Design a binder for this molecule. Sequence first.
Ligand SMILES: NC(=O)C1=CN([C@@H]2O[C@H](COP(=O)(O)OP(=O)(O)OC[C@H]3O[C@@H](n4cnc5c(N)ncnc54)[C@H](O)[C@@H]3O)[C@@H](O)[C@H]2O)C=CC1
Ligand SMILES: NC(=O)C1=CN([C@@H]2O[C@H](COP(=O)(O)OP(=O)(O)OC[C@H]3O[C@@H](n4cnc5c(N)ncnc54)[C@H](O)[C@@H]3O)[C@@H](O)[C@H]2O)C=CC1
Ligand SMILES: NC(=O)c1ccc[n+]([C@@H]2O[C@H](COP(=O)([O-])OP(=O)(O)OC[C@H]3O[C@@H](n4cnc5c(N)ncnc54)[C@H](O)[C@@H]3O)[C@@H](O)[C@H]2O)c1
Ligand SMILES: NC(=O)c1ccc[n+]([C@@H]2O[C@H](COP(=O)([O-])OP(=O)(O)OC[C@H]3O[C@@H](n4cnc5c(N)ncnc54)[C@H](O)[C@@H]3O)[C@@H](O)[C@H]2O)c1
Lengths: 337, 337, 337, 337
Amino acid sequence: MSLRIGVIGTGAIGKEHINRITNKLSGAEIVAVTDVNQEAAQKVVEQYQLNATVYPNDDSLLADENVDAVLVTSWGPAHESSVLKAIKAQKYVFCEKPLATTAEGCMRIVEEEIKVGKRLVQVGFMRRYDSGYVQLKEALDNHVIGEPLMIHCAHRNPTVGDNYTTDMAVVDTLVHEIDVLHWLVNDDYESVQVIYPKKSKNALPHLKDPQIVVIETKGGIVINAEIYVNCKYGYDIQCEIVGEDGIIKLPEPSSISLRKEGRFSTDILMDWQRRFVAAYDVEIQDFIDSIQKKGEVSGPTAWDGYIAAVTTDACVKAQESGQKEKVELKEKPEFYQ
Amino acid sequence: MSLRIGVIGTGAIGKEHINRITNKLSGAEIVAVTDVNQEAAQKVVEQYQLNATVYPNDDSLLADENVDAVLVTSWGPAHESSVLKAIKAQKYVFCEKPLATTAEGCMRIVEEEIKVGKRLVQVGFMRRYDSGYVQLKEALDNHVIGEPLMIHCAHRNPTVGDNYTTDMAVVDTLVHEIDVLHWLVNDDYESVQVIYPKKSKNALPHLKDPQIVVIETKGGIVINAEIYVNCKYGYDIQCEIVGEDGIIKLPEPSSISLRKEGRFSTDILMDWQRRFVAAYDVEIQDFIDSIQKKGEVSGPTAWDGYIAAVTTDACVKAQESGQKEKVELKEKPEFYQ
Amino acid sequence: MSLRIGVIGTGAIGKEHINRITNKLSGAEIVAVTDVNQEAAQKVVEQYQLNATVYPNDDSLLADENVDAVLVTSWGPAHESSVLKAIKAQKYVFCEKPLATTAEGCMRIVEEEIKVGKRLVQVGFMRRYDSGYVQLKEALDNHVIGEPLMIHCAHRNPTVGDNYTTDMAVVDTLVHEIDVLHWLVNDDYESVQVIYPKKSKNALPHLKDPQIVVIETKGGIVINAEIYVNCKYGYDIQCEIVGEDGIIKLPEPSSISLRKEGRFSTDILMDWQRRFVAAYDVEIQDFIDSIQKKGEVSGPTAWDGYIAAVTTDACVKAQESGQKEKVELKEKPEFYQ
Amino acid sequence: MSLRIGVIGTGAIGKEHINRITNKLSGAEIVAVTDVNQEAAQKVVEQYQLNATVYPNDDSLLADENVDAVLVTSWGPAHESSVLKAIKAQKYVFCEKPLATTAEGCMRIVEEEIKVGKRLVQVGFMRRYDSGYVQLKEALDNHVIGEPLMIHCAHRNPTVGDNYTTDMAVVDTLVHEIDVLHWLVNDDYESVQVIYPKKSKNALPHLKDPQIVVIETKGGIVINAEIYVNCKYGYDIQCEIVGEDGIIKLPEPSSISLRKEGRFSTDILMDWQRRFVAAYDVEIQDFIDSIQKKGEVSGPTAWDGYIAAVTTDACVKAQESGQKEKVELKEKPEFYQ
Ligand SMILES: NC(=O)C1=CN([C@@H]2O[C@H](COP(=O)(O)OP(=O)(O)OC[C@H]3O[C@@H](n4cnc5c(N)ncnc54)[C@H](O)[C@@H]3O)[C@@H](O)[C@H]2O)C=CC1
Ligand SMILES: NC(=O)C1=CN([C@@H]2O[C@H](COP(=O)(O)OP(=O)(O)OC[C@H]3O[C@@H](n4cnc5c(N)ncnc54)[C@H](O)[C@@H]3O)[C@@H](O)[C@H]2O)C=CC1
Ligand SMILES: NC(=O)c1ccc[n+]([C@@H]2O[C@H](COP(=O)([O-])OP(=O)(O)OC[C@H]3O[C@@H](n4cnc5c(N)ncnc54)[C@H](O)[C@@H]3O)[C@@H](O)[C@H]2O)c1
Ligand SMILES: NC(=O)c1ccc[n+]([C@@H]2O[C@H](COP(=O)([O-])OP(=O)(O)OC[C@H]3O[C@@H](n4cnc5c(N)ncnc54)[C@H](O)[C@@H]3O)[C@@H](O)[C@H]2O)c1
């Protein structure tokens, strides 16, 4: 008997989560949907031949007792509300990033979840499910390189839109690195600093691209993260961890090699959407399996969402002050360990 | 409404196909099972909490009208029977290799399928679904390297069992290369020759390991395939296609790199079972989707099974004669194109 | 017509330069060695069956009207003196790093040379002669990746002795990076910040290891250099240059690949001596050839030695400071461009 | 005390050997050149401002009591003669491949040398001086992968001229492989089979290209070598050795990596001249050094030239035959081990 899932927000990402739950994964189905654009939701239900109730809003959908879990995939600033509602409604919630657009909004969600007494919230930081990052994790966990000391990483995007603005590099783009890194090395951030190199000809005048973000943890690990969203050549994620006795590095995505016209080459992905498809599948399949096999969620926690939110705020501060900002976290409530 | 699947043979592989259909894939369920060891099948149904009828044999299971598709995963020599039955019973059949242990047994299945008037048989040559081989396919299809001229490939296994015998290298091991290569280059085999290098210390006295198999197609492509099932270092699949204007090569499985104690390294898989897990998932998911979206199967055909069987026979001949044997194929019935 | 050469300081590197000039290169011979240890110099004269003269001091060696050029290869502090004399005595001089231990000492040498009217002083920054770096320079000169924006480099070393001190990391180690980088990107530095990650267990109590050095050029290029001299795994030099439209990267030293015991690996050098052996040969040969053909030296200028001296000064300052120290440079004299 | 050297045949390669000895290496000079074209030789004497004598023929050049050694670097057929004279005249001889164009001509040279009592003849198979192959030899000598069982190698070239003929593929091209392989694995050949794949569109009507050459040693090692001289993409040499417990492989030539326009790539050389330039320098230097230190030459022996001559004979035979031709070799004389 399948997990019955209500989706709040039926845009490009909600539609993709609906397609995988419906045609790829196992153990769940979509029974309810709601969208700010109620017409758009109706089209979705028809597009994917769903057996779903179309509601006017999220309270209606959460009111429906036949639904046991929700996917929060609405406009970013809209997330905090639905998450809060679903928690008090005591449903299982998978929330796409961000958990909330402010550190406060995350704190409210943390405080609420601690009441309900168990893990209901899983945040959509999918990198933790990528086979590469999983391997890095296993290696560190087995002490293969001794104590981590430094981390170098890059998040490169071929080109962004006119809409894309300087702060979005940290709040949208760097946010994945921010979650996965502290998860990898089991350490909390302490300071951040932003350094702007010469502008790139490919960046529009209103955008500061590229950027370099330096982040120290409490234990003293030093991270320097390169963000270049108009790098032109492709979509590219790189991550090298330098330990005491060795170095481990994230793999390139699999590609056939080619010998032709003077070059020995492999492919580089252009579309960000193809880089992590496997991690999304595994991320959602786990949300399901975990509930039906543990009566709770297992992925990135509400607390992690808070950490992301705080560190993000610090980065945006550093962005505009050119200073070394501090990352001040509240104590980790034992509820999350 | 899901495809309802009966499984004939509930051993190690049937159990794996049952686990994926039940807990990973989408659009199907197991409703019937049968096994030579009827007790073993009962245990399976309990192990995976299935809603399935346990039958005494395959005619009983095929007689059941509520089942619409079968997985033939029994002892190798047992396949030909169930496949024939399921065809006359007009059910959809996914048959694990071999389709039949003789070229004749394949011909019977081909002749039978052509009667029933549509594609019911899909053979379990999963390599066609591997993302690497798919990329090689796309490149050749796009004429990236011009006409293929030669192919070098290797199928290496760490170590085999006491049970493993010389002929098994071609009938079991090389059989995957035999299917995928002719699929890649759209050409039929014409001759085969086996050359035995110095024996390996890791091979038991009764086994001829390693082996080299040279195969020419009709168009003149020359294949030389290395088989070394006691290579010790790992499980390894390599494939290089040399064209007129360039060279394309199969990727290593993804791994993190390590810098430690004088070496810069990546991992090599030890267990063959981890090499193709993604292709099995995609292979079966396609068997399903195709039926429910086309009213027929789409993968490797009964004819391909025949080709595999014929080429295999030729290789075993060459094995013992040290001669250049001929691969004599009957004309490809238009039913398969 | 062999160029007659005298060596001031038959030390470790002095011995090697003597051996390559004597037994590998073309068009020159050692005719005079002087060492602060008269007996050391004598051992070397018999070591390489040299037909040379042993002098108590440089004055007398330089007085020898035979010597056309000198190799200044003794203690770092003892360089400025020998160099200045050599210029006044108007001999050709190849000086191993550093040119002088003080930014001013180098400016003193800069002036003397300008007077003499031609270039007599070449500094031993051999990296400029490495095929790798030469390839990098070629690609940059050809606009292959457009404008350089960022550079990520690392200089790692298995272990050091009790004598290796925190500042030696920027004085003796990072010095090569500081030279080659500005040569490559054709830009002047401006600021250096030093960031100390968690100290490694492989470092001795008195040493700060690892260290990160961020460096901004006046054009806007940001450079972060990792120095880790107790990395344990091997001796390793990495350099990646991120441009507007692409990325170029320094190769690993050629090594055979090996597949064995679950790993696919290349070799990492364990000894800094082996890393640039070819660069030395090409270096000295150019000294010789340049003189015999043009009547002057060619390599890194005395000015580059000064550029080094200054930059490495700001780094030693940022080591204690913790702040963004400044790099003020005198304007480049007409003499050098 | 420079070794005085005379060059017989100031051709393309003769010019290069003259240039490296004159301007790169140590301990030798060119004092006499003779060419079948008196005016060609004269151009070269002024070309490299040589202080040499121009002789109408080799007899007169060898008569010159100045020359201590000769470089035999003229038309292939014109080698045996010049070599034999040189031995009778008791000079040191470095002979570029081939030693002689007939297996017997080489056996003639073998005998003459044995008489003289020491080794005067070194053959120009420079691959033995390549760091890559040297690394391979080292690993094999150390038993890193246990017993060699198979070797896969390829010799590819962008394009050839109208003059390049089918047999030149084994005479001029595969010849280097034939030498270095037996050196590496310390084994004698035994049989050669030639297999002609589908002919490439880049080959001229009169040429058989590509070709595959299978070769068995008397120890049981199987070697398949691909020769493709119209591969278009570049000049490329590959060599992989499969042992009992591991695999070792020849590196690509060092190149910088580039990420640009959806591709991650290294450079493939376009000109065979650039591939082994270092091997030549090390080759000639060893000729010189070996003589000045030991009073004899060191490299590939006259016997290896004969081993080549024979093997390449069986290959030219298998080219027309189509059968498994035989390689009978005279027993190795005491003189060579
Ligand atoms: N580019 C590179 O990778 C390397 C360059 N070097 C540089 O070379 C210099 C020293 O090299 P090492 O052989 O490693 O050290 P070293 O200590 O062995 O060489 C010093 C030797 O020269 C003699 N000496 C010192 N001062 C002298 C003077 N005023 N006159 C005559 N003789 C004198 C000493 O007796 C001693 O034997 C340093 O400046 C160092 O930075 C060192 C190693 C590597
Ligand atoms: N190891 C390698 O990669 C290479 C070696 N070679 C070998 O070198 C030889 C020729 O090399 P190339 O310069 O390419 O050809 P080449 O034709 O330019 O050299 C022949 C030259 O020597 C002169 N010559 C011919 N016979 C002579 C004789 N009996 N006495 C005096 N002079 C004579 C001719 O006038 C001509 O100028 C061949 O044996 C070839 O196999 C050629 C190229 C590469
Ligand atoms: N994990 C990832 O790498 C990843 C990738 C893309 C997007 N996201 C995140 O997922 C969220 C959704 O992204 P998207 O690209 O699908 O957005 P979108 O603009 O394509 O679609 C959002 C949909 O939600 C609806 N909506 C807006 N406000 C709502 C509300 N208050 N209640 C119910 N529905 C509402 C809109 O009508 C729209 O149909 C964003 O917050 C985004 O940051 C995460
Ligand atoms: N695609 C691949 O790479 C791959 C991998 C493994 C196995 N296979 C093939 O799949 C088949 C099954 O392999 P396996 O390892 O699971 O075998 P197995 O021995 O582990 O199990 C076979 C099961 O089938 C049952 N059986 C035997 N004869 C039967 C019959 N006549 N009718 C019904 N059931 C019968 C047996 O009792 C047993 O439980 C083999 O033919 C094998 O070659 C393919």
